[model samples]
Target chain A: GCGKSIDDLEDELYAQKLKYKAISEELDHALKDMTSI
Target chain B: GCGKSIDDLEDELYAQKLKYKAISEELDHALKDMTSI
Candidate 1:
């Protein structure tokens, strides 16, 4: 009940998770590039 | 690479976990506060 920042952190974490997913997609693209050529 | 995901969430979670611990201690204090009176 005392930690106000928890919500903020949680939201930030959520956004970060989405960003990470996007990066992982890029990583996927990198992997695909390997197969494309 | 510039999205600041994955790692950022991990670090934030780590910090929030520490903060959660601190709040837990406060809960303990409240419990003691009630017990003492």
Candidate 2:
């Protein structure tokens, strides 16, 4: 496998932050409104 | 504002698989251990 540069890895990890934000809203809003299902 | 039935929301949420099925693993693995690896 090719080695990834530290800068690129930083962006990769930063993108991980973006992923967390997107899903938290999704998982949450559903349960709050689930009501029964 | 317009309103949608719960049935419609259900389909919408499940539609693209709605980023689900694994979002569970996403958040779970997060607390379990992350970037540490």
Candidate 3:
């Protein structure tokens, strides 16, 4: 029922982008920790 | 270089999985809207 506007999808995409950013950071740290050992 | 243990990667994998699930659901809704019109 979201055919009302593109704003909704845009908002969801923004949230997904943030989630991807956080995941990227976590993966970076994980790799760093692994190499440290 | 992540030979330390599987536990570390396992935790990251879990988080990534959740994020992916959310993204998938969002995409499904987005597509549904696109087709509704």
Candidate 4:
């Protein structure tokens, strides 16, 4: 749906925002751990 | 479509249905606490 132009996903959906949020949080947590030293 | 299906999924759907039904029935039969081991 994202690639199909089903909608401007970045602009319109809170769930979509949360999808990225979950992933970004995981990455940020991982990065913070890695950079802690 | 079979081979021409949009999912590129083939007879696998039928095979999956069979496996899913079998496993589902097995789970149902095994759901008793006495059967949970």
| Candidate number achieving the greatest TM-score relative to the actual structure | 1
Worst 10 residues of 3 chain B by lDDT: B1-10
Ranking of models by lDDT: 1, 3, 2, 4
Model 4 CA RMSD to the hidden true structure, in angstroms: 14.5
Would candidate 3 be rated incorrect, acceptable, medium or high by CAPRI criteria?
A: incorrect
Best by DockQ: 1
lDDT of each: 0.53, 0.46, 0.51, 0.41
Which is the leading candidate under lDDT? 1
Per-candidate DockQ vs. reference: 0.06, 0.04, 0.03, 0.02
Q: List the residue pairs that clash in candidate 2.
A: none
Candidate 3 lDDT at B7 equals 39
Put down candidate 2 lDDT per residue, A1-37, tens digits, no spaces: 2232444444444554466467677555444444333
Give the range of the ten consecutive residues with the poorest summed lDDT in model 1 chain B.
B1-10
- Candidate 4 wrong stretches, greater than 4 Å: A1-37, B1-8, B33-37
Candidate 3 lDDT tens digits, B1-37: 1334433344454555686676556555445444433
Indicate the worst ten consecutive residues by lDDT in candidate 4 chain A.
Answer: A5-14
User: Which 10 consecutive positions of candidate 2 chain B have the poorest summed lDDT?
Assistant: B1-10
Chain B TM, every candidate: 0.47, 0.36, 0.44, 0.56
Per-residue lDDT, model 2, residue B5, is 41
Clash counts for all predictions: 0, 0, 0, 0
User: Where does model 1 exceed 4 Å of error?
Assistant: A2-4, B1-37
lDDT per residue as tens, model 2, B1-37: 0132434433343442434546767556544443333
If scored against the real structure, what TM-score would every candidate get?
A: 0.42, 0.39, 0.40, 0.34
